Design an enzyme around this catalytic site. Sequence first.
Site, PDB file in Angstrom:
ATOM      1  N   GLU A 248       0.829  -1.175   0.000  1.00  0.00           N
ATOM      2  CA  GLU A 248       0.000   0.000   0.000  1.00  0.00           C
ATOM      3  C   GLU A 248       0.874   1.239   0.000  1.00  0.00           C
ATOM      4  O   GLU A 248       1.584   1.489   0.973  1.00  0.00           O
ATOM      5  CB  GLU A 248      -0.934   0.056   1.167  1.00  0.00           C
ATOM      6  CG  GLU A 248      -1.738   1.363   1.202  1.00  0.00           C
ATOM      7  CD  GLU A 248      -2.669   1.491   2.400  1.00  0.00           C
ATOM      8  OE1 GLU A 248      -2.911   0.547   3.152  1.00  0.00           O
ATOM      9  OE2 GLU A 248      -3.152   2.617   2.602  1.00  0.00           O
TER      10      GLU A 248
ATOM     11  N   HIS B  90      13.736  -4.993   3.850  1.00  0.00           N
ATOM     12  CA  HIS B  90      13.402  -5.083   2.435  1.00  0.00           C
ATOM     13  C   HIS B  90      12.050  -5.747   2.298  1.00  0.00           C
ATOM     14  O   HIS B  90      11.480  -6.271   3.263  1.00  0.00           O
ATOM     15  CB  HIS B  90      14.430  -5.924   1.667  1.00  0.00           C
ATOM     16  CG  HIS B  90      14.521  -7.322   2.166  1.00  0.00           C
ATOM     17  ND1 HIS B  90      15.641  -7.810   2.790  1.00  0.00           N
ATOM     18  CD2 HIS B  90      13.665  -8.355   2.067  1.00  0.00           C
ATOM     19  CE1 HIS B  90      15.442  -9.071   3.102  1.00  0.00           C
ATOM     20  NE2 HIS B  90      14.260  -9.429   2.668  1.00  0.00           N
TER      21      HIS B  90
ATOM     22  N   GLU C  39      14.395  -7.682  -2.326  1.00  0.00           N
ATOM     23  CA  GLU C  39      15.141  -8.901  -2.585  1.00  0.00           C
ATOM     24  C   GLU C  39      14.357  -9.742  -3.605  1.00  0.00           C
ATOM     25  O   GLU C  39      13.128  -9.903  -3.479  1.00  0.00           O
ATOM     26  CB  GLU C  39      15.260  -9.704  -1.303  1.00  0.00           C
ATOM     27  CG  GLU C  39      16.225 -10.905  -1.479  1.00  0.00           C
ATOM     28  CD  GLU C  39      16.462 -11.769  -0.304  1.00  0.00           C
ATOM     29  OE1 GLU C  39      15.722 -11.605   0.698  1.00  0.00           O
ATOM     30  OE2 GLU C  39      17.322 -12.717  -0.465  1.00  0.00           O
TER      31      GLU C  39
END
Length: 281
Positions: free
Chosen positions: A64, A82, A130
């Site tokens: 979001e 991440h 990642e």
Amino acid sequence: VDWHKHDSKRMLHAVYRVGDLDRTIKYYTECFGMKLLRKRDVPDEKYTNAFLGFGPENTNFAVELTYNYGVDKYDIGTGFGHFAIANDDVYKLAENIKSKGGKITREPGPVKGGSTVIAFAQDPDGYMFELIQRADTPEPLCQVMLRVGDLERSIKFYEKALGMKLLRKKDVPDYKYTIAMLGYADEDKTTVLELTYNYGVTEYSKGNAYAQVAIGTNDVYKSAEAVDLATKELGGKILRQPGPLPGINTKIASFVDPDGWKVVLVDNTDFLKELHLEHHH
Ligand code: NA
Ligand code: NI
């Protein structure tokens, strides 16, 4: 206590702020293969949300994005790790990201050992993604990784406050870190919370970029009770007490964990009502 067994919780979305909504949308759709799911402008409060991911929000996790009118930069801080995307061909994905104008910070190849193939990409605001090579993922948006100062304390907190399961724990003294994967389903089928402890590091900045993760629950009052009981033993605090939001009436509660990371509990039915009003009306 026993309420977690009776509840049906789900990771809904990670909420974070972006300097330029169209630019991020373009990067996520073109580089990462996300779909723009929903967009909500709230000009009375000078913000716009966009929700993106790989499947509909009623069955999938999403990101979001929050765009505050005129605000073009944020501070990520040191604690935010991440988001991870799982894909069956990370070499091809990293090549796609480059060819669309994106940025690869860690080229595709096996990790430490090896042998899981990973890569890292960096989005326009600086958030790290990642890329993890997995053959048949049911939920590509597969991790939110945050750093924590005491992993045992955090594991207990997510179990007792939120009914998460400790899915996997991996200590790597050679590189001075330990990780834990927490969630509501098997790791290879779900979005996990990955908590990272660095040896002898007990604090990080929260920044102002990442906002919170949202988790759906069948009863925000019962879940908030559980959280309050946890925070008394382990730390963290309820912020917004459980109840309906004005106007829309979505029931929520919010709190911070022992490290300061923010969580929002959302009534599962009310969340579906929100989705319905957007898509079908
Ligand atoms: Na790492
Ligand atoms: Ni209707």
